[PDB]
Amino acid sequence: EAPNQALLRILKETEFKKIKVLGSGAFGTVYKGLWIPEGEKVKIPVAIKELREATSPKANKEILDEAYVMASVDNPHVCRLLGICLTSTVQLIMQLMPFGCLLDYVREHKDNIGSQYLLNWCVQIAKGMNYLEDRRLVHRDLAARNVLVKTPQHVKITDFGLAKLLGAEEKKVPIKWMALESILHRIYTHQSDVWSYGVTVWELMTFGSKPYDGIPASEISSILEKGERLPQPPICTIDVYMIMVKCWMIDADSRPKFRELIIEFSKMARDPQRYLVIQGDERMHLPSPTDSNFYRALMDEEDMDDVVDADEYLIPQ
Ligand SMILES: */C=C\C(=O)Nc1cc(Nc2ncc(Cl)c(Nc3ccccc3S(=O)(=O)C(C)C)n2)c(OC)cc1N1CCN(CC)CC1
Ligand SMILES: [Cl-]
Ligand SMILES: [Cl-]
Ligand SMILES: [Cl-]
Ligand SMILES: [Cl-]
């Protein structure tokens, strides 16, 4: 295979300050924060994923795998890794996605989310996945909770901790998002991801409902073998639902390519009303502020005159 000449950047902990906890897990905490590169004179809104514990070697090995992958990708719909910090525990410094989970987002704003937005998120997510396929990368954990929202206009994929190379046979499980071939055979492929992509498209079409809700995960393998699938969402045209259903074929080669899913949804986003029926589609506004005022309250700090988003902070430094 090709040599991987990604640069891994090492940051001083002095260069950045934590501001708020975004998420607390066992063995990890995620901070909203600010980062000032050294001698740069720019301020960069970051999220900082840190391990509370000392190893936890398996946990420690999993965070460095995640940094390895994230450092090795460059795409507008994949999340950037800015660098790592070699403190008592290892920290990942990544671009901050100010609007959070796409999952959280759809539930919080379901009454103000129009068809153009849904169709385009579908297009972008596919594009990210297609980029990962291009790089021979299998995500193995696509879901709406792992898609982050930079602006309402711009989502990016994330959570590469489980990400493996194709055919790697590398050393909880979501289950509901998992292809049948993955549940029975621990087989994972880009077309395995295509399945998870379908379940994600479903999660968005229902504004965040739980797949196979009230069904125990142990049951699911039998359900999918019988021929049962997720129901057709209300807002959902047969055309869109028919796309989901093809992602959920038994024969993974018959499932659509991410290459194709970009094209299909892209066409639908040209006439978004014809493929998704949303009550009051017109008087729907989703607000993205780009003002220097906007960043505060968050990281209220004081003066954000020198903010640069990660996407505008490029290197060779
Ligand atoms: C639905 C959970 C979520 O994503 N909440 C969230 C996310 C962000 N933005 C953001 N930007 C960059 C990163 Cl790396 C993360 N990571 C992150 C944040 C929170 C939980 C988990 C992760 S992670 O996927 O494990 C990463 C690989 C470490 N997040 C955000 O920016 C403001 C705010 C939120 N939330 C958290 C939940 N909160 C209500 C309790 C609403 C806003
Ligand atoms: Cl500082
Ligand atoms: Cl966490
Ligand atoms: Cl500096
Ligand atoms: Cl970058």
SS3 299: coil
For ligand 1, residues with CB inside 6 Å are: 22-23, 30, 32, 47, 49, 94, 96-98, 100-101, 103-104, 145, 148, 158-159
User: Residue 271 catalytic?
Assistant: no
In 188-197, which positions are buried (b, 16+ CB within 10 angstroms) versus exposed (e)? bbbbbbbbbb
Query: What long-range pairs does 188-191 form, CB within 8 A, spacing at least 24?
Result: 188/138, 188/140, 188/164, 189/138, 189/252, 190/129, 190/132, 190/133, 190/138, 190/166, 190/257, 190/258, 191/252, 191/253, 191/255
- State the closest ligand 1 atom to the C-alpha of 160, by its place in the atom list counted from 1: 27
Tell me the technique behind this structure.
X-ray
SS3 10: strand
The CATH H-level superfamily of 1-96 is Phosphorylase Kinase; domain 1 (3.30.200.20)
What's the CA gap between 177 and 195, in Å, rounded?
7
Paired sense of beta strands 44-50 and 90-95, if any: antiparallel
Nearest alpha-carbon partner for 168 in 245, 257, 65, 81: 65
In the chain, which ranges are E strands? 16-25, 28-35, 44-50, 81-86, 90-95, 137-138, 147-151, 154-157, 164-165
Resolution in A: 3.0
**CATH 1.10.510.10 residue window(s) in the chain:** 97-286
Q: Ligand nearest 42 Cα, by number?
A: 4
Of 74, 141, 253, 305, the catalytic one is 141
**CATH 3.30.200.20 residue window(s) in the chain:** 1-96
Domain 97-286 in this protein, CATH class? mainly alpha
